[PDB]
A paper describes a structure:
UPF0201 family proteins constitute one such uncharacterized, archaeal specific protein family. The UPF0201 family proteins occur as a single globular α/β domain with approximate dimensions of 55×35×35 Å3. The protomeric structure consists of a five-stranded, anti-parallel β-sheet, five α helices, which are located on one face of the β-sheet, and three loops connecting helices and strands. We have further documented that all members of this archaeal specific protein family share a common polypeptide chain fold, which is evolutionarily related to the RRM motif found in the ribosomal L5 proteins and many other RNA-binding proteins.
For 10077b and 10077c from [name] and [name] P2, respectively, full-length constructs bearing C-terminal His6 tags yielded crystals and structures. Our four UPF0201 structures represent subfamilies N149845 (10077a, b) and N130963 (10077c, d). The crystallographic asymmetric units contain one protomer in 10077c, two in 10077b and four protomers in both 10077a and 10077d. While 10077a, 10077b and 10077d all form one type of dimer (typeI), 10077c forms altogether different dimer via crystallographic symmetry (typeII). For type II dimer in 10077c, the interface surface area is larger and equal to 982 Å2. At the type II interface the turn connecting -strand β1 and helix α2 interacts with the turn that connects helix α4 and β5 (residues Gly115-Asp117). Majority of the interactions seen at the type II assembly interface are due to exchange of strands β2, β3, and the turn connecting them (residues Gly25-Asp50) between the two monomers. Moreover, this part of the structure in 10077c is about 5 residues longer compared to the other three. The interactions involve a large number of residues, which include Ser9, His13, Glu14, Thr15, Glu16, Asp17, His46, Asn49, Glu55, Asp116 and Gly117 of 10077c. Despite that the type II assembly involves large number of interactions and presumably more stable than the type I, such an assembly is seen only in one among the four structures reported here.
Residue numbers in the entry: 4 to 85, 88 to 128, 131 to 144
The structure:
């Protein structure tokens, strides 16, 4: 139905390192997505960067799929085992450190993460990752 990647990058962070990591890790599907970069700031030179990637339906399912084929079973179960749902969209917040330092998807808490939001039009949702979690095992 649709998928979105969203990350807030700070001054102290290596913006390029993150971009390359993300565009590579999700390569080459992410090459077909709409990329957005925006910069916000306060009144005292405090800049935040908002990096986004939109996936249309065509690449939506394929984006979820690639996340499923990359995430370790441990973290996957940790998902099913779960509060990451609002409406029909699933919010998966990944650890920035782990992805750029070890190309590894490790769930993390909060908004200071690489956020992946998937939108379903079926709700039900569980059974599929379960069959996969179950399958992998």
């Amino acid at each position: 139905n649709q998928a979105i990647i969203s990350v807030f990058i700070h001054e102290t962070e290596d913006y390029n390192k993150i971009v390359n990591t993300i565009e590579s890790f999700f390569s080459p599907l992410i090459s077909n997505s709409k990329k957005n970069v925006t910069t916000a700031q306060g009144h005292y030179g405090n800049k935040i960067i908002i990096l986004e990637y939109r996936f249309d339906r065509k690449s939506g399912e394929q984006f979820f799929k690639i996340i499923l084929e990359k995430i370790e079973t441990s973290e996957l179960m940790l998902i099913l085992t779960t509060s990451h749902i609002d409406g029909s969209k699933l919010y998966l917040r990944f650890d920035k450190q782990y992805l750029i330092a070890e190309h590894r998807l490790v769930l993390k808490e909060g908004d200071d993460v690489i956020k992946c939001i998937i939108s379903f039009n079926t709700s039900n949702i569980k059974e599929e990752i379960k069959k996969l979690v179950n399958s992998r095992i």
